[PDB]
């Protein structure tokens, strides 16, 4: 029962134990913005219809 | 190695009513061969078979005197195929089948190998395949059949009953006795759709659905019977009435093959 | 206790001290199995030689960008003697030594540098064996290589000489090889230069030059016989075709 | 100045920043500075390193090396710096005044004098046949004829960088010669006559077998008298 | 990599030095290297040094059963397995390669087939019990000439070995401890020694095969650098009774027969000196042991 | 959220998985820190003397054992031979058994390092434990005369013992399981009686009569293993620990400090292996391991028949 | 009506009823019943039957109530880098370990590769497929790292040896390697360590940056998007 | 032997209808497994089979999968290498007709069978073939490999016949010794055994989910 | 005492030779070099270890010795400094110094010491220093003997091998690399044996430091 209530942390991606909420929020905010490929693909639409 | 289009064309030709073979042969017709015998003076018997496509086999027969109470089997076959390992699966399968077809009670008359109430001759069969392009079971069988019918053995001249008083066996220094044992023959068949084929070629084996191995001895079908896969990309199941057809075909056309190997 | 060399100058089989055994050879005996082939009969010896190549290598590891790779395989059957052999000879050290010696002999003679990125394979089958088998192997390889149309500098001929007390005997058989020491030679063309020299038993130091000279003359005669056979076959081939 | 062993205390104040040289390791887990080699520790903006004995070369940027061409590819050569080591690469555009029409003409088996330009840990090292830092071309290229001598790394460093090492001066007092020194453990020499080159080869081998630099002159005199 | 790379300059330099009668290490064309032999504390423990080549040998024995075919003889075997200790160009387990097979066959023909050891003296009870003798050769450092060093080491170790004294007590046998009944040596019938020659072509192949002059070059006991550039090789074994034990020239550069006979005649002067040196060293070791045992009384 | 199954996580990042599991008080094998696996055995069911009234005549097996621990199965069988013997607590008076070990992992070929090392260590530990005296393998041969055999209530002979061990469904190190299975199989061996009819004397084994094998029953020991891990502060979920009976992929890949013990119920020890390639090993952990191994051996000794 | 559960050899439906098309886990087989030819879709797996419209209908059998192929998602480990490509080894195919047994402990003590022990020289080549612990291999070309600016990609600024990377299969390739791509926002590095595998784990901070928690050092990667 | 401990060289070896139970999936480090155990009046047999794959293969590109079958003794070494290899070849011929090999390009499948137990409670390898076929079918179904049909077999007087498609097709035929004129009776008896084995196999697959 | 020599072979990177009573071992080291494709490790150095006996051919007895040597040597080397490279280590036993049919601990200790000396001579990065001794417990007297002779091994009750790790000038014990005990013993005997072995190992490592400094210093300027 310990494993069932402790999922999404026992089997997740690595996040450091003592991470301040500010740093976590900054990390989350970066990935909510376009990736380098997204910007280039956005502009190429006008060229190749 | 064949392409998809070639295989489709060949299968459409072979699985038709009536069947069409690539060289125009009949379903029961064999290909020409050449036979030579008695060309290794140091052996008791020998033969060489050359097929029309380059396949070649050489057989040697040698003997030894043994105590037939300790020794259980008086016929032993050893097979060597050029380009294959000594422990290859096909080599050992052929060795096992050929030792089974020449066992003690199979139609082979082993009473002709007995000298003295205690001793007997043991026969060694050595097979060397120089070149081959398909399953060489029937070629080796034909070569063994040819070699065994031209074998001569030393003649005993020193007593026969030695249960109480035993003397070393002694043989005449010039004379020999022809061996008149009864050797069997092994046939291989191919299944292509609803047809049965005798003596299949290399390209016909690449499209066959299955195959059969049938033994023959002095007018009757003999025990060793197997189903064999002649390829790995087209093997499928077959209906039971094709087995009976193959047995009848071998029974009908075996005597003609016997007359072709005479002398 | 036998008369190896009688006071009348005769050996056990009726030959004299400087006579070769019967020598018969055939060329192009297996057209469907190899590019070059030969069948050699020297006394009671029987050998089949096949030459495959030049051709694409099987593996990308055995590829050379400057010359061809040469391989030799020798198979000695279980029925080649009077007594049947108990086990196989495929992986014996003696057979590996023979194969290495043949490869190193023929590396210097074949122009391997004009066939880069290829492989040449030699397969040999010995059916009957009655003494002096190494020279027969050399002669068969030479004939099969020439039959395949592969460039070389000259012929190589094999021969065996036995020394019986003070008497040299040429081209010995199994009976003589079990009663005296022997020497095997490989001679290039019509010269005095040796490609192979093999002595396996004891021989006095002051008795080797005479044996070498006798063997060299015998090998020259062997080369003459091989050349005559090759010319006759070529004449027959070109006369009609 | 002092002899040190792996696992010993490092005698440097932790406050002062010191740049680390060969033989000194910074632990990636504890961030601790410790020595890993045996030898003499030299401390000079100050730099510390350990001088230790070695024979197997490891590429490092700005080193002068001598290599052998072992293979030609579509755009570069394959070069060996030592037997049984991983090979390095020399680019066709790494020659002076190089262009797609002015191709190099080196073959498999040639000797080359070059400089290490790239030594990334995750990649294969690269060499060039001209000093790109300064634009100078001082002796880089093919070495024709001559003979090659194998030595250890400390000896090669002493020959290349120390001007008080007396071997070249004592050799110049017997003959005129050309020389190239590689830090991978190679020395190339050439004279006008083969006997002089042979005497130089023997002298260099014998001097490297020894450790005393005061016996070089006697060795050279004896070797050059031997060849008559 | 496992490949030893040689540049064109080195090959050209060495061949041109051979054209002017020069060797890199200062020897003449017919000069053999100096041999050092050292004996260990136990019997059959020998170290052999030839310039920079180092070889170690060990002899041992134990009780076994004779073969059914030959019930009057003991057993003798020789093992030579090479390791990367002698050089990184050698594989760990490789007994099928060309050079290893050739070396093993040459040593076997020189020592075991020639009957240098008396195997009929190894029989204890005819048909049931005998001695089995082993020779183990360890290769420590390679600068050429393993065959000659191995032959010398094996022969010296065989001539240095002693085996425990035994007695037959009815059906079984008793093996006495060494501190009781003075172990005994083996019987040696002759002492064979091998010599190796190397051949170089200063011209092309056409001159070697069709030319009239014979300008080939022969040297004795090549080093590692020299034997990586040779075109042929010859090994001959001889004893002091002027007997040719074996000759091996397995292909390579074709050579005129008179030159080969000259090589065979040059080897004898070397083997005589080597035999005398071995005998003197063995005598000195025996005297040293006897003197120490007397002083320890 | 992005999540991986436990097997995938153990395959791609075993150290992180082990650190995450330990901070919760559990193990990736789902046990407590000092908890062992349960053991069930089945003795002497494949031997020719398995049925006391009906003796198999085509069977040459003298002793047997089948062991189950978790998901791993071990099968052990023992056979025999006879050799003619021509020519205290010291080790010169003791014998051993010759084992051959097969671990089924999907490979065809020769033996691996694991099998060879396990076989050699089994042989050596049997020899060092003073379990099998040499006088316990001496043959008291009889004679058959006109036909009946008379036993004594010239030449000499000794017994030779061989073992074959097959491991199925391996999940971790298996030396302890093999040793314990072989210990169970040795206490059930029966030696057949032998009689006799350049000389040729042939010794023949009796078809149904046998005698038991006499071993030092106070020298029998049982095996266990332990591991030591150092905790990583940055990997703990929302100092060193001691772990018993290592199992599963994550533990075998990440732990490099281990302890192995052979302990006898009498109170002494027969084997001890310390290998510190990871965290530091202190005397307290050694003492704790010794106590735990004593308890485990006491449990394993008095558990069956 | 269609069956609910299936086993190998179980007939499902005829070709018409709508034209039925066999999907994964099914096959089309000729049958002869009562002297007349019959066509049917036959299950090849144990599982449940589901049909989706793609008229043409696709019939599939899904296990429950492998081998990599084009379009699959895999987890890999980087082995080698060069200027043109990256070499990886495949560890899991769609959240299932491949192979089941990795061979840990087969070579004894220490840290050894799968083929670095004594058993690698005695493997029977002609009697099996591959040796214990062998895996599928793949190649990522520099032009496949991303979809844009695929001519200025620096490989060592994207991956390092020892990293865990999520990729997608493009082609079966030759007999040695598959061909893989990471040109999507959810593909890239998921696990990495500082100091080229000698340090501790790092955590993703931006699309092209990772950070070490113990010491605030940063390195460049091509980070796969978390959450 | 340098890799095994075989003991002293001079030692000599000592010289002195059917009810089934089927279970699958009990071996951890493989892909699929099965246990077959059969008992009657005068015989008793136990078998274990394991499947490894699909896995990588050495060589050049192949468009379809490859199958390898290995037979091993157990406890008692009652058979030699040649007959075991012949039976393996026969089984490989059978199972090349039922596996959908076109689904697994450039990969291999390895199958291991262990002959654990075989006792006579009251011509010997032929009667063991049907149980091997049943075990291999069960393990292949457990591992998730695609099969076009469930293959079974029967034995009658030295003849072994393997069926698919409710006994209307033949995938394998074996005959040693026996009567020459007895062919129809053998087919009927083998089919009668095959139907029962097929029922039991389907029940085992359906129940143990 | 012990005798050790450094740098005696010509075609390897490093070599040594260790003698202790009647036990003699010679070792060589070559690396870092290019490995085979199947030995390669992505991030660290790989090892290849070979041990050869004094008589006969190598068997499974030498495999255990190779395994223990690999266990001891792996934590000593700074393996992460040489990614995907190889180091070859070969040990040849010249004289066993004991009865090989029963005991193998003296050979193990001598091999450990010789391999450490060869690694120092080659120039491989090392974390610390090492030393190894054999120990035995004799019957009747129940005395603990450090460095037993061959006669004392024949009347022993248990035999032990201890290898330790030293830092900070050879005065601080960092870890226990290997302890291998076989026989019959209790806890008090074990904890007395460890205490004696630590002092003996400290003396040995001091002696080894002196030998290394004597040999290496003339090669530098």
PDB file of N, CA and C in Angstrom, chain I residues 140-167:
ATOM      1  N   UNK I 140      46.713 -26.926  18.226  1.00  0.00           N
ATOM      2  CA  UNK I 140      47.239 -27.140  19.573  1.00  0.00           C
ATOM      3  C   UNK I 140      47.569 -25.825  20.268  1.00  0.00           C
ATOM      4  N   UNK I 141      48.570 -25.106  19.759  1.00  0.00           N
ATOM      5  CA  UNK I 141      48.958 -23.840  20.371  1.00  0.00           C
ATOM      6  C   UNK I 141      47.888 -22.773  20.189  1.00  0.00           C
ATOM      7  N   UNK I 142      47.140 -22.831  19.085  1.00  0.00           N
ATOM      8  CA  UNK I 142      46.141 -21.819  18.740  1.00  0.00           C
ATOM      9  C   UNK I 142      46.767 -20.428  18.669  1.00  0.00           C
ATOM     10  N   UNK I 143      47.958 -20.350  18.086  1.00  0.00           N
ATOM     11  CA  UNK I 143      48.663 -19.092  17.895  1.00  0.00           C
ATOM     12  C   UNK I 143      48.410 -18.551  16.494  1.00  0.00           C
ATOM     13  N   UNK I 144      48.400 -17.227  16.384  1.00  0.00           N
ATOM     14  CA  UNK I 144      48.160 -16.536  15.123  1.00  0.00           C
ATOM     15  C   UNK I 144      49.508 -16.153  14.528  1.00  0.00           C
ATOM     16  N   UNK I 145      49.804 -16.682  13.345  1.00  0.00           N
ATOM     17  CA  UNK I 145      51.106 -16.530  12.705  1.00  0.00           C
ATOM     18  C   UNK I 145      50.941 -15.654  11.471  1.00  0.00           C
ATOM     19  N   UNK I 146      51.689 -14.558  11.422  1.00  0.00           N
ATOM     20  CA  UNK I 146      51.729 -13.687  10.254  1.00  0.00           C
ATOM     21  C   UNK I 146      52.857 -14.151   9.343  1.00  0.00           C
ATOM     22  N   UNK I 147      52.554 -14.288   8.051  1.00  0.00           N
ATOM     23  CA  UNK I 147      53.461 -14.807   7.031  1.00  0.00           C
ATOM     24  C   UNK I 147      53.917 -16.221   7.376  1.00  0.00           C
ATOM     25  N   UNK I 148      53.012 -17.198   7.390  1.00  0.00           N
ATOM     26  CA  UNK I 148      53.415 -18.568   7.719  1.00  0.00           C
ATOM     27  C   UNK I 148      54.272 -19.188   6.628  1.00  0.00           C
ATOM     28  N   UNK I 149      55.102 -20.144   7.032  1.00  0.00           N
ATOM     29  CA  UNK I 149      55.891 -20.914   6.087  1.00  0.00           C
ATOM     30  C   UNK I 149      55.052 -22.057   5.521  1.00  0.00           C
ATOM     31  N   UNK I 150      55.652 -22.836   4.621  1.00  0.00           N
ATOM     32  CA  UNK I 150      54.939 -23.971   4.043  1.00  0.00           C
ATOM     33  C   UNK I 150      54.749 -25.094   5.054  1.00  0.00           C
ATOM     34  N   UNK I 151      55.662 -25.226   6.020  1.00  0.00           N
ATOM     35  CA  UNK I 151      55.515 -26.261   7.039  1.00  0.00           C
ATOM     36  C   UNK I 151      54.405 -25.919   8.023  1.00  0.00           C
ATOM     37  N   UNK I 152      54.235 -24.633   8.335  1.00  0.00           N
ATOM     38  CA  UNK I 152      53.184 -24.224   9.257  1.00  0.00           C
ATOM     39  C   UNK I 152      51.798 -24.297   8.629  1.00  0.00           C
ATOM     40  N   UNK I 153      51.702 -24.251   7.300  1.00  0.00           N
ATOM     41  CA  UNK I 153      50.398 -24.370   6.658  1.00  0.00           C
ATOM     42  C   UNK I 153      49.861 -25.793   6.733  1.00  0.00           C
ATOM     43  N   UNK I 154      50.745 -26.787   6.812  1.00  0.00           N
ATOM     44  CA  UNK I 154      50.313 -28.178   6.832  1.00  0.00           C
ATOM     45  C   UNK I 154      49.714 -28.603   8.166  1.00  0.00           C
ATOM     46  N   UNK I 155      49.847 -27.795   9.215  1.00  0.00           N
ATOM     47  CA  UNK I 155      49.295 -28.145  10.518  1.00  0.00           C
ATOM     48  C   UNK I 155      48.387 -27.028  11.009  1.00  0.00           C
ATOM     49  N   UNK I 156      47.796 -26.285  10.081  1.00  0.00           N
ATOM     50  CA  UNK I 156      46.952 -25.157  10.435  1.00  0.00           C
ATOM     51  C   UNK I 156      45.494 -25.587  10.577  1.00  0.00           C
ATOM     52  N   UNK I 157      44.692 -24.688  11.146  1.00  0.00           N
ATOM     53  CA  UNK I 157      43.256 -24.884  11.283  1.00  0.00           C
ATOM     54  C   UNK I 157      42.431 -23.927  10.440  1.00  0.00           C
ATOM     55  N   UNK I 158      42.940 -22.728  10.168  1.00  0.00           N
ATOM     56  CA  UNK I 158      42.279 -21.789   9.277  1.00  0.00           C
ATOM     57  C   UNK I 158      43.330 -20.873   8.668  1.00  0.00           C
ATOM     58  N   UNK I 159      43.072 -20.428   7.440  1.00  0.00           N
ATOM     59  CA  UNK I 159      43.996 -19.591   6.686  1.00  0.00           C
ATOM     60  C   UNK I 159      43.251 -18.355   6.199  1.00  0.00           C
ATOM     61  N   UNK I 160      43.924 -17.205   6.237  1.00  0.00           N
ATOM     62  CA  UNK I 160      43.287 -15.926   5.957  1.00  0.00           C
ATOM     63  C   UNK I 160      44.170 -15.076   5.055  1.00  0.00           C
ATOM     64  N   UNK I 161      43.527 -14.216   4.266  1.00  0.00           N
ATOM     65  CA  UNK I 161      44.204 -13.231   3.432  1.00  0.00           C
ATOM     66  C   UNK I 161      43.588 -11.865   3.695  1.00  0.00           C
ATOM     67  N   UNK I 162      44.430 -10.873   3.976  1.00  0.00           N
ATOM     68  CA  UNK I 162      43.972  -9.530   4.309  1.00  0.00           C
ATOM     69  C   UNK I 162      44.655  -8.510   3.410  1.00  0.00           C
ATOM     70  N   UNK I 163      43.861  -7.637   2.793  1.00  0.00           N
ATOM     71  CA  UNK I 163      44.363  -6.541   1.974  1.00  0.00           C
ATOM     72  C   UNK I 163      43.705  -5.247   2.428  1.00  0.00           C
ATOM     73  N   UNK I 164      44.514  -4.228   2.698  1.00  0.00           N
ATOM     74  CA  UNK I 164      44.030  -2.977   3.264  1.00  0.00           C
ATOM     75  C   UNK I 164      44.357  -1.804   2.347  1.00  0.00           C
ATOM     76  N   UNK I 165      43.751  -0.662   2.660  1.00  0.00           N
ATOM     77  CA  UNK I 165      43.876   0.559   1.875  1.00  0.00           C
ATOM     78  C   UNK I 165      44.344   1.686   2.786  1.00  0.00           C
ATOM     79  N   UNK I 166      45.407   2.381   2.385  1.00  0.00           N
ATOM     80  CA  UNK I 166      46.047   3.392   3.216  1.00  0.00           C
ATOM     81  C   UNK I 166      46.050   4.744   2.516  1.00  0.00           C
ATOM     82  N   UNK I 167      45.876   5.811   3.299  1.00  0.00           N
ATOM     83  CA  UNK I 167      45.945   7.184   2.812  1.00  0.00           C
ATOM     84  C   UNK I 167      46.738   8.020   3.810  1.00  0.00           C
TER      85      UNK I 167
END
